Amino acid sequence: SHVKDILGLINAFNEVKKITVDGTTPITVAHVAALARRHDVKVALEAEQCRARVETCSSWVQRKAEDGADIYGVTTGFGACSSRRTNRLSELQESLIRCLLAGVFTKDELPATATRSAMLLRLNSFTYGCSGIRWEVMEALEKLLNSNVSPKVPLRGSVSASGDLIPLAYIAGLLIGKPSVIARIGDDVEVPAPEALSRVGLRPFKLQAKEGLALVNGTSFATAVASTVMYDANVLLLLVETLCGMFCEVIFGREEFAHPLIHKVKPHPGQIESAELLEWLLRSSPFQELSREYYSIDKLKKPKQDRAALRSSPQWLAPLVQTIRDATTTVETEVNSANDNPIIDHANDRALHGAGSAVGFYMDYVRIAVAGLGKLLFAQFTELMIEYYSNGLPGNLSLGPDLSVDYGLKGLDIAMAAYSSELQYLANPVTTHVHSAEQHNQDINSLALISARKTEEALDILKLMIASHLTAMCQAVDLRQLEEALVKVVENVVSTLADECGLPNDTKARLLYVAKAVPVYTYLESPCDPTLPLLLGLKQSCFDTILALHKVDRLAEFEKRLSDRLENEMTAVRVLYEKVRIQGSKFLPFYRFVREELDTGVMSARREQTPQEDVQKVFDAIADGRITVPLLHCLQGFL
Amino acid sequence: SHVKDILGLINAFNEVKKITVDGTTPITVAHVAALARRHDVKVALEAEQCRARVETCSSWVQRKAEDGADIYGVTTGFGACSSRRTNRLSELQESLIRCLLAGVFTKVDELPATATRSAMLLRLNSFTYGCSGIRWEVMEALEKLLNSNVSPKVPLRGSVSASGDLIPLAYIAGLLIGKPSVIARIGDDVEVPAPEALSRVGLRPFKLQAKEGLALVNGTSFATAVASTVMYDANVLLLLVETLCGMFCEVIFGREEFAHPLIHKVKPHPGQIESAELLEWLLRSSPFQELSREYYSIDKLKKPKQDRAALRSSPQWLAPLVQTIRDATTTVETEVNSANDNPIIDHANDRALHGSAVGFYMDYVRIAVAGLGKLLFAQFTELMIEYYSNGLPGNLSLGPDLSVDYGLKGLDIAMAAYSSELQYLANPVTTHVHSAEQHNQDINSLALISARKTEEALDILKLMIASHLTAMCQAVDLRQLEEALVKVVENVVSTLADECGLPNDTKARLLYVAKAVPVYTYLESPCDPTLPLLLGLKQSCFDTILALHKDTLVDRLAEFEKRLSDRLENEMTAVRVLYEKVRIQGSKFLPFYRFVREELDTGVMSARREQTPQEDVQKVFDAIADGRITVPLLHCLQGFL
Amino acid sequence: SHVKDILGLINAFNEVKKITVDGTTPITVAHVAALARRHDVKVALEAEQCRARVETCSSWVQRKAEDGADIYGVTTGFGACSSRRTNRLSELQESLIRCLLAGVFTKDELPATATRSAMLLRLNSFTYGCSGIRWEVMEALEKLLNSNVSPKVPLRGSVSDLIPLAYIAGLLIGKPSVIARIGDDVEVPAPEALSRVGLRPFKLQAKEGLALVNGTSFATAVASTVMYDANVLLLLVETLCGMFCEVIFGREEFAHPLIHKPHPGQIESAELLEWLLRSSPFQELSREYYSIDKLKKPKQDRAALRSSPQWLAPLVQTIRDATTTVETEVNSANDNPIIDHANDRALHGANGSAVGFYMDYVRIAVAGLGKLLFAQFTELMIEYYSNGLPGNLSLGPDLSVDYGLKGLDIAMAAYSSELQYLANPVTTHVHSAEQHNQDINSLALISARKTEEALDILKLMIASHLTAMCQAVDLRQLEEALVKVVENVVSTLADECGLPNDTKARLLYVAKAVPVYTYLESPCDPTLPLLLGLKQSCFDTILALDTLVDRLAEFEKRLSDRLENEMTAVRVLYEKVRIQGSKFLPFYRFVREELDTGVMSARREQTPQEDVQKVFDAIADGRITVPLLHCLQGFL
Amino acid sequence: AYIAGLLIGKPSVIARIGDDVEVPAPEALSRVGLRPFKLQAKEGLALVNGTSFATAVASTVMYDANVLLLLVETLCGMFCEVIFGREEFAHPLIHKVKPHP
């Protein structure tokens, strides 16, 4: 189950303290994201496992170069200039870095999290011992990483062909102490690269044979961004899947949409797996119990089936689960590889001439799956706001009671459409815009880094959408509970006033059915308004009871005493609520987290906090990883 | 390996005789393609394996319907109207079909018969799971319609592929009930009203029973049909493109090292290892790689150490495209081998239980196809330009009069046009979901629309493959002629050095030049003193005079030049003229070259061959389009393991 | 006003008998469309006006080439091979055509309509006297055009129009391999084609091959018919927004002149809509509806109605501006080099980027028009938004076996979804082409073909919209006649049963106020809104005032005796008025009477397809312009 | 709405004052000698119901698009000069015959 795999990734992300870098131990996207996001996470470069192969490779290269062997990027020019030969070994490598320090700072940069991640991947790539880089440079990299030092890197300039040439040149730039490369030390300090190395007790390196190319010729930045993108995509996917369950509960859906047999006959692994999760989440739900009751009232006048954003959520999610899982595998494969050219095969004494394409394509695919995830959340959000489709819920989830001055989540509804519209636009592909580049030497190139940044932007928006959706659903939980409490109050007042005014058994029964049947939010605004659905039904029932008993003083008395008692008792129960079925729900951890740990309450005109203040707290908890606590809680026992 | 798997799909496509439909035996995309494209392929609905469960389900549905059980789309309305109930069971079903016969025929566009017949197959197969409630008799009629080449004329557009391809499948339903306004084709010319079609094959119109209208329209059969034949073709063309990278390496004088197993072991994307393993195997004993190594040992330090990316990075480029196309095939097959219907009758448990994968994966496959096309455009571009082609003439023009021979220039122009439209097609369809059907279908997959765009992208890829293979056979010829021409030049220069009595030092320099200068730089006029053969000869003559200085030498050099301009052009013309009326013989790509040249009856293009570039590429494209191209492909890969 | 200019284009397309090709008389998108669609339209190449300059140019080029002048594509190679020189003038031109006959026929080709339009445009370019083409070749083109002869041309291959134009050249030189159509049926090799119209294959002279192939006549040809259709369909959509307002019970106030008074397209579309609705009998019903329970009904219409003029504004501008741009390209010399014989020189430039870019813009505007139509249709199908209309516009009365226009609703979403996808740009996919000598290129033909496909879909959406709207006219008219029956029945029964003035009045109100289509299925069902309302009022009257209880019970009894039969009767009568006073009468009449349709229901045997197809065919073939012009007459 | 929120001194609305200072909206209003407004009839909607932000960004976009276009046009001339182009491509009669303005 993909649910297990993702829980495994989340647990690894939180628990790891030391990333082992040795050329055999795999780095997962959870490891990359943990280093990027938790500064207590340290790298350990293991000498006993890979120092030997590195020093052998490095020395092989330096010797071969000095004896004038004809090797690409070592004694020949780069890319389109590979026909040029030199014996100025060091000068060849330094001229490479110089030509590649060619990005520009706008008024924007790759963030520190990305840059350090790239530094991690570049270090790891060296541990396979194919690069010819010196051990010392690797130790310097490990130390730069653990000391929280990183170059400031221009956003743009990589087409990610054989490598992310320009952004990786800035890491090489820091390593050789270029004065014009600026480096961050922690969050506050910025100093030239020579001052940076000095403060952590390193000296500038002079580049040897192949070292400039080894340092720039990989796809480390794209894969860095793709790794945190893929970490986040896995978590947010599991979060979206889970909340489809919560959506069913609050919308009064039919849980049958998640029956294992519907999906066993149409067996997409992601479809089966998501249905399996949903069935489990909803199994003995106290909210489904209210749903069943709701549909038994006027059964034949209510929809037999839910709308597609609920009922076909497991089929919609299926391919999205598969896309995100396969892309995680593909990115991890890239993380755990020697991306570099030439590959040094020191054992058989050849430098091998070959080559970011896997990452570029899969980031395109994931961006389309993220767009699908946002489209599902938009459609669910839209249904929840419209009283015709929310099975009892008031429009915009406005508590009112005075609806003319309470527009509830109308603002969040508008923001949802804006989020989803930009998201769909973002999901056009990047890899279809390949230009013939670098004197036509890179006549194909992956554009992985650019595609990775767009998918990263796509996830940022999904987060916004998940934040709003979860907020709306806690609003709806509160509204359903209040609804239960209100209908009970109405039934009681009607039952007792029936006894008090001494109306026949028939009249009592007819009147109590109306109290049960009328959606309370259709008349909460003014329960004794003669034109609103409570009084409208009661009047119909009264005229009906007059005809059936034919072969009035008490009915006029019942009505009069209804507008004495009803509103006040309804107000009291609401007011009391403002200062329960969620307790038996699998989604209790989410509601408790949002309401208690974040300190929110049912939205209304009498709560001074804006929607912004409420959603922000939820967004922040999503952004920083705290949401995974209620998520793991909600999920435990699923196996 | 994906190679053996694709070889298996082609073998199944060619060899299958009968498609067994029984509710357990899997239908693959080759079966769907086989049924669509080979009318001798027959559908065999096996009663013994599934008739009994169909009748149980059928009978169960009717019984529950007549008892007034409340079951979606059986005693309730459909879609956004599911809150309406009736006991008018047959009219409920006929009213659904009526309302869905709502497409328009444009100007004439329609789903093709290949797609409609495929959809018919998939709808029949779905019914064999015994969950639908449809009568066994309706299934037999479908098998008979399929086997008799009758299909409804179906409008191109109208489906959003939510729970079903509602409008298109209403036309299959409209045929089975003999709606007179539903036109049916029988074979390729004949078109008649539905009642006449049914009579011509000995069936009578059906009266719809409970749930039967819904059963006929409520799955994603048209999108899945189109996507199946799309995935079959994607698999074939992918393999073709991978194989042709090898042939590109041979004719462009690439370095085979790009495909070495260690490069890909250290970056182990499954598609990367596997495409390279194939390429390595394809180029192992190549006589063209032999010419290549020979070419780079001449003026070694004045020549690129690496090839360009379109060659050198083809395994890395291909890897994700292989994975995309292979994973999409599995996804589409999973969809083929399912009961796409709602509600599901679970007659065993006495209950009724109430097109997305294909849309997304079609979007992904369209991106992979644009990527394959980008690879082809880039290779073809290198091949056309003398700066990047390592001895080939611009546009692969044979000449020798280049001012009146533009070679494959028109093809080059068209390749740009093909690639540009292709990159445009690869924008996603799934990002354009509208809230549909009174907001009941607020998500929908658009799978049929997406599948159609991927089909169009594949149609363009076929064009590009055809031109590329054509350009590569042109390049094979030019390489073989080049080799033969250089030998004549060497021989003539060698015999004239003797006749004229030139020193060994002079002879050495003059023979070096004849070997080193690319023949196609001076072919137009071999004795033109301003072209590279003579320039190089003149340079070496000045060098030999200066080296032998410590007269009659100049006299003999002058004689050498005079006699060269008497004899060399004639001997070069003769060898070329002879060639117009070998190393390809030792090459894994002989089957392609032999297929294009002898089986399709082509020749090296020039001003003297009267056939247009159109006429040559049309033959190759018709071969790719109709599957004949898989014979050389299978011959070429014979023995790969 | 853009509305006058569009009626001007439509008039011209209908009336033109002859296309004068003379080198100064402009060709409009309407002339191109007419030549392509009406075969009685003929080309008249006017010798007296342009033969002199063509011959002067032709001779200059021939003489200069013979003298050994260094002129691109005349004594030099083409494109990236322009460093190659030759004295072999004719062979140079023939080898260019040979190399460019490089399209493939897939299973597909440019339609004859486009191919003939390209031949027209090419002929026209030649009359400017800059090409060096011979007069004889131009006369041969006119003769080919007027005799319905045209080469079969592959769909793809131009980055913009070397390959496709090479097939026109191949016809003229009688290449065996080039296939020509003659009318609808006959297909023969080019040499046979020329023979049949009494022509001989040409031997190309200096610059001739290049002159025949070196401009963008195909992209411009497709662009021209595309722009003609976009103007016509634009005006159709604008007009039908007015018909949508009538059937949906919208508020005409959205079209008031001061709101907009000022994007020209915004002012002008509003000005049209205001006029179309000024004396509408349907707006009279709308006002009446909104005065019934005013404070319980929306104050504003939804955006797809209320903001239609603002939506349409940039769409009008885009289509109008693109039209001007295509016409500029039509009335130009696209060729290179440009021979300026007057001053004894050849001019080496690049005369089609304008068309590529604007086709991308227009494809976006067409997508925009479609979204509007989708949004209106959607509203119309949903009872919550249609102001009294039944869901799916289903007549019933048995809604459980009548799904009305639901199939059309579904189709509309498919249409719109595909349309939005199409509207992505083409010009952003420029590849570095032709040995990198065409490192920019416009892709105009490809873009034009995409916009053409986008219009195809818009026609589908308009045909469905117009069908829904006539369904909606019938339902409103039936609504009004049905409400009067209920009012009469309630009224006379109140008398017969002798209820007071108070009761009669409350019951009359309910009959007036309750939306009929909420109870038509079973008017006397106690759970449906009519009897729910009457029971509320009867209880009210009992309190505010016996044997009255007797008279009410008899009222309720005689209602399920009289009511359903009389409602059934008017509907049955209707299936076997306010539209008569509406500007939109010609559309309703055209669809109902001229196309022979009727209100859709379970009792009408025609499928939705049968109905919409007729409306589509009429849109596709231009008959829709007859009602369009009738509806618009008097608008100034 | 953030502009309206400032004008009415919402504490949750932060305001910028120059480059350095960020303060809650009531303290922002205080410093410029202004007091929170109490919204009267239609003032809320009048403040939010227009397309002022889109048009604002669109305005700085169009200004820049004009400047950069002219700069691109001008730099084609510079490219001609350094690449050894033929200036004949800009001769007026070529373009008079294809008169896109």
PDB file of N, CA and C in Angstrom, chain B residues 532-560:
ATOM      1  N   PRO B 532      39.079  22.009 -51.898  1.00  0.00           N
ATOM      2  CA  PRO B 532      40.052  21.476 -50.946  1.00  0.00           C
ATOM      3  C   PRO B 532      41.035  20.381 -51.393  1.00  0.00           C
ATOM      4  N   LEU B 533      40.734  19.593 -52.426  1.00  0.00           N
ATOM      5  CA  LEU B 533      41.703  18.559 -52.866  1.00  0.00           C
ATOM      6  C   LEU B 533      42.953  19.224 -53.461  1.00  0.00           C
ATOM      7  N   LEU B 534      42.739  20.146 -54.385  1.00  0.00           N
ATOM      8  CA  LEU B 534      43.818  20.847 -55.030  1.00  0.00           C
ATOM      9  C   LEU B 534      44.588  21.762 -54.081  1.00  0.00           C
ATOM     10  N   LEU B 535      43.871  22.505 -53.229  1.00  0.00           N
ATOM     11  CA  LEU B 535      44.498  23.336 -52.194  1.00  0.00           C
ATOM     12  C   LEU B 535      45.478  22.500 -51.371  1.00  0.00           C
ATOM     13  N   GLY B 536      44.977  21.394 -50.824  1.00  0.00           N
ATOM     14  CA  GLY B 536      45.801  20.467 -50.061  1.00  0.00           C
ATOM     15  C   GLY B 536      46.953  19.885 -50.853  1.00  0.00           C
ATOM     16  N   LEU B 537      46.738  19.626 -52.136  1.00  0.00           N
ATOM     17  CA  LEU B 537      47.816  19.108 -52.978  1.00  0.00           C
ATOM     18  C   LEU B 537      48.882  20.187 -53.176  1.00  0.00           C
ATOM     19  N   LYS B 538      48.439  21.406 -53.442  1.00  0.00           N
ATOM     20  CA  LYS B 538      49.329  22.538 -53.634  1.00  0.00           C
ATOM     21  C   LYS B 538      50.160  22.866 -52.404  1.00  0.00           C
ATOM     22  N   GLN B 539      49.525  22.838 -51.232  1.00  0.00           N
ATOM     23  CA  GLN B 539      50.208  22.977 -49.959  1.00  0.00           C
ATOM     24  C   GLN B 539      51.321  21.937 -49.772  1.00  0.00           C
ATOM     25  N   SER B 540      51.005  20.671 -50.017  1.00  0.00           N
ATOM     26  CA  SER B 540      51.996  19.618 -49.885  1.00  0.00           C
ATOM     27  C   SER B 540      53.106  19.714 -50.934  1.00  0.00           C
ATOM     28  N   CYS B 541      52.795  20.291 -52.092  1.00  0.00           N
ATOM     29  CA  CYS B 541      53.808  20.499 -53.123  1.00  0.00           C
ATOM     30  C   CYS B 541      54.830  21.555 -52.704  1.00  0.00           C
ATOM     31  N   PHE B 542      54.343  22.655 -52.127  1.00  0.00           N
ATOM     32  CA  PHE B 542      55.243  23.663 -51.616  1.00  0.00           C
ATOM     33  C   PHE B 542      56.083  23.075 -50.483  1.00  0.00           C
ATOM     34  N   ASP B 543      55.465  22.251 -49.647  1.00  0.00           N
ATOM     35  CA  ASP B 543      56.183  21.613 -48.548  1.00  0.00           C
ATOM     36  C   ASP B 543      57.284  20.657 -49.038  1.00  0.00           C
ATOM     37  N   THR B 544      57.038  19.960 -50.142  1.00  0.00           N
ATOM     38  CA  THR B 544      57.977  18.952 -50.641  1.00  0.00           C
ATOM     39  C   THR B 544      59.168  19.636 -51.322  1.00  0.00           C
ATOM     40  N   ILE B 545      58.900  20.727 -52.038  1.00  0.00           N
ATOM     41  CA  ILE B 545      59.946  21.538 -52.648  1.00  0.00           C
ATOM     42  C   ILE B 545      60.861  22.093 -51.562  1.00  0.00           C
ATOM     43  N   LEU B 546      60.280  22.682 -50.519  1.00  0.00           N
ATOM     44  CA  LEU B 546      61.084  23.187 -49.415  1.00  0.00           C
ATOM     45  C   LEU B 546      61.830  22.087 -48.656  1.00  0.00           C
ATOM     46  N   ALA B 547      61.239  20.898 -48.525  1.00  0.00           N
ATOM     47  CA  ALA B 547      61.919  19.819 -47.785  1.00  0.00           C
ATOM     48  C   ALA B 547      63.033  19.125 -48.589  1.00  0.00           C
ATOM     49  N   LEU B 548      62.888  19.078 -49.913  1.00  0.00           N
ATOM     50  CA  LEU B 548      63.869  18.409 -50.768  1.00  0.00           C
ATOM     51  C   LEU B 548      64.913  19.361 -51.357  1.00  0.00           C
ATOM     52  N   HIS B 549      64.832  20.639 -50.996  1.00  0.00           N
ATOM     53  CA  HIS B 549      65.719  21.661 -51.551  1.00  0.00           C
ATOM     54  C   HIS B 549      67.180  21.401 -51.268  1.00  0.00           C
ATOM     55  N   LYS B 550      67.489  20.853 -50.096  1.00  0.00           N
ATOM     56  CA  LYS B 550      68.803  20.221 -49.882  1.00  0.00           C
ATOM     57  C   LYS B 550      68.711  18.781 -49.362  1.00  0.00           C
ATOM     58  N   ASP B 551      63.174  22.110 -59.674  1.00  0.00           N
ATOM     59  CA  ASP B 551      64.038  22.115 -60.855  1.00  0.00           C
ATOM     60  C   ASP B 551      63.432  21.192 -61.912  1.00  0.00           C
ATOM     61  N   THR B 552      63.850  19.932 -61.871  1.00  0.00           N
ATOM     62  CA  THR B 552      63.179  18.875 -62.604  1.00  0.00           C
ATOM     63  C   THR B 552      62.015  18.414 -61.713  1.00  0.00           C
ATOM     64  N   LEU B 553      62.167  18.597 -60.398  1.00  0.00           N
ATOM     65  CA  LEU B 553      61.093  18.344 -59.430  1.00  0.00           C
ATOM     66  C   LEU B 553      59.848  19.164 -59.739  1.00  0.00           C
ATOM     67  N   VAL B 554      60.038  20.462 -59.966  1.00  0.00           N
ATOM     68  CA  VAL B 554      58.944  21.370 -60.310  1.00  0.00           C
ATOM     69  C   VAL B 554      58.283  20.939 -61.624  1.00  0.00           C
ATOM     70  N   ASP B 555      59.108  20.567 -62.607  1.00  0.00           N
ATOM     71  CA  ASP B 555      58.647  20.037 -63.900  1.00  0.00           C
ATOM     72  C   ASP B 555      57.683  18.842 -63.765  1.00  0.00           C
ATOM     73  N   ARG B 556      58.043  17.892 -62.904  1.00  0.00           N
ATOM     74  CA  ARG B 556      57.259  16.687 -62.665  1.00  0.00           C
ATOM     75  C   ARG B 556      55.997  16.996 -61.833  1.00  0.00           C
ATOM     76  N   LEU B 557      56.124  17.858 -60.824  1.00  0.00           N
ATOM     77  CA  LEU B 557      54.947  18.359 -60.090  1.00  0.00           C
ATOM     78  C   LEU B 557      53.930  19.018 -61.018  1.00  0.00           C
ATOM     79  N   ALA B 558      54.411  19.835 -61.958  1.00  0.00           N
ATOM     80  CA  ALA B 558      53.550  20.480 -62.961  1.00  0.00           C
ATOM     81  C   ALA B 558      52.875  19.436 -63.832  1.00  0.00           C
ATOM     82  N   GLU B 559      53.624  18.376 -64.138  1.00  0.00           N
ATOM     83  CA  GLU B 559      53.106  17.297 -64.967  1.00  0.00           C
ATOM     84  C   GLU B 559      52.037  16.520 -64.196  1.00  0.00           C
ATOM     85  N   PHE B 560      52.335  16.174 -62.947  1.00  0.00           N
ATOM     86  CA  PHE B 560      51.347  15.572 -62.038  1.00  0.00           C
ATOM     87  C   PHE B 560      50.005  16.330 -62.058  1.00  0.00           C
TER      88      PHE B 560
END
